[PDB]
Each structure stands twice: as structure tokens, then as C-alpha cells.
Amino acid sequence: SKGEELFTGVVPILVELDGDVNGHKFSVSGEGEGDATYGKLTLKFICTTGKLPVPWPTLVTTFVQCFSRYPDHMKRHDFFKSAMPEGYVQERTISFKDDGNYKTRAEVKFEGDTLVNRIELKGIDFKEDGNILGHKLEYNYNSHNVYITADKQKNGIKANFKIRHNIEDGSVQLADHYQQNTPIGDGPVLLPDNHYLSVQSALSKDPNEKRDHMVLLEFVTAAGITH
Ligand SMILES: [Mg+2]
Ligand SMILES: [Mg+2]
């Protein structure tokens, strides 16, 4: 199909986020590339407003599931690529257990040959010395499954999943995710059977980078359907 063919090679990625969390306003710019043939993402993010007022790991899911590797036998379930190049809206509520929430609205689409993720993020109800505003989360990331289901009235999909962020005391900060995606364009899009994305993510630092930043290497494979 038209959309899937845009992802057979390495595709440059740009990410741009504006955020307001409890009145802390910030912006992040990211660059990198994706190779959906291998489910592979490499991205580097820079906070362009100074210090990021929330922990970098809490923004990983917000900062391009069109780069998931869908096995050939699951091609008919890949909503994300099918919406391209016109793109999709991706909205979430991320609920941090016993703390605040993020609401995110993003548009993921091509600008020329570059895949762009533009996000507006709003966070409210955070505790001043909770794990988020108190910066008590470890700089690392666990592997998780993203459970996808069709959302036919929206011509799209929804997803649910639980992210667990390690806390510096050894505990875990749960971030429940609810997600809805809607296509922007008028091409046919794929409405999938239930399945999941199996994600692993590794966070690192650029030793030469003095701005506040995050390097992400991520691998994602679609799964849960045998034929
Ligand atoms: Mg292929
Ligand atoms: Mg069927």
C-alpha cells in the first residue's frame, strides 16, 4: 500500500514538543531516524528552554509508532503506516499514580521525506515534591507492551498500557496510558484486529552534550497475531 512503502528504508524523524506542567512551560526539539524494517528508532532530544522541569523518562512515550516492525503476516493491521503520508492525530491521557496527569495531542505526518511528530502537552495536578516535579525517577526505561484495538467510529485505533518508571528508592511510579489515534487524510486506513506492540527502550546521554537532553534507542515489534 501507499503508506507502508514510505517506510521500507531509513526515514529521518523530527520531534517538536511544547509543554506546560503545573505552569512550568518548556519546549523540546528532537532529531533522529527510524528503520521500520527492523522496528528501530534512534532519537536525540534537547530541552531548548533550559532545564526540563519533569524527568526525561516521563516524556519517552509522548516523543512515532509508524516505525514499529509489523511482521509481513500482520501488515493488514498496521494503522500507523496506512495513515501516511497525511498522518494521524495521536492523543493520550497519561495518569501518574498518586500524582498528576499529562494530556497530549500530537500530529504525526510527513513533511517532505521527513516524519514529524508535533506535540502539545499539558500537565496538571502534580505534587510539588512528587516523583515527577521532585525529579525522583531513575534515568532508564523498562520494556512494555502497547495493547491496540480498533476505533471504527473515529476511523482509527485506541490503545491502553501501563508504563512503570523506576524510582530512585527502588520503587516504581506507574503511568497509566490511554491513547486514541485518528487519521488526518482521506486515504483508506487499516482498522486492525487486537494486537500489541512489544517495546524496549534504552536511554543514554551524549557525553559531549551540555544542554539538558536525552538519547533514546528503541525497538518495537508488533505481535499477538499468529496468521
Ligand atoms: Mg518489509
Ligand atoms: Mg477477522
Author numbering: 2 to 64, 68 to 231
Report text from the authors:
Green fluorescent protein (GFP), discovered from Aequorea victoria, emits green light after absorption of blue light. GFP has a β-barrel fold, and the chromophore is formed at the center from the three amino acid residues Ser65, Tyr66 and Gly675,6. The protonation state of the chromophore differs between the two states, A and B. The phenolic group in the chromophore is protonated and neutral in the A state, while it is deprotonated and negatively charged in the B state. Spectroscopic measurements of the photoreaction of the A-type chromophore revealed the presence of the excited state proton transfer (ESPT) reaction, and a photoreaction model was proposed that includes the intermediate (I) state in addition to the A and B states.
The A state is stabilized in the T203V and T203I variants of GFP, while the B state is stabilized in the E222Q variant. The X-ray structures of the T203V variant and wild-type GFP were determined at 1.2 Å and 1.48 Å resolution. The conformations of the residue at position 203 are gauche- for both. Gln222 in the T203V variant and Glu222 in wild-type GFP are in the same conformation as Gln222 in the T203V/E222Q variant. On the other hands, weaker hydrogen bonds longer that 3.0 Å were observed in the T203V variant and wild-type GFP as well as the T203V/E222Q variant at pH 5.0. The side chain conformations of the residues at position 203 in the A-variants T203V and T203I as well as in wild-type GFP are almost identical to those in the I stabilizing variants T203V/E222Q and T203I/E222Q. This indicates that the conformation at the position 203 is the same in the A and I states. On a plot for the two structural parameters, the three states appear in different regions. In other words, structures spectroscopically suggested to be in the I state (T203V/E222Q and T203I/E222Q) is positioned in the low right area in the plot, while those to be in the A (T203V/E222Q at pH 5.0, T203V, T203I and wild-type GFP) and B (S65T and E222Q) states are in the middle-high right and low left areas, respectively.
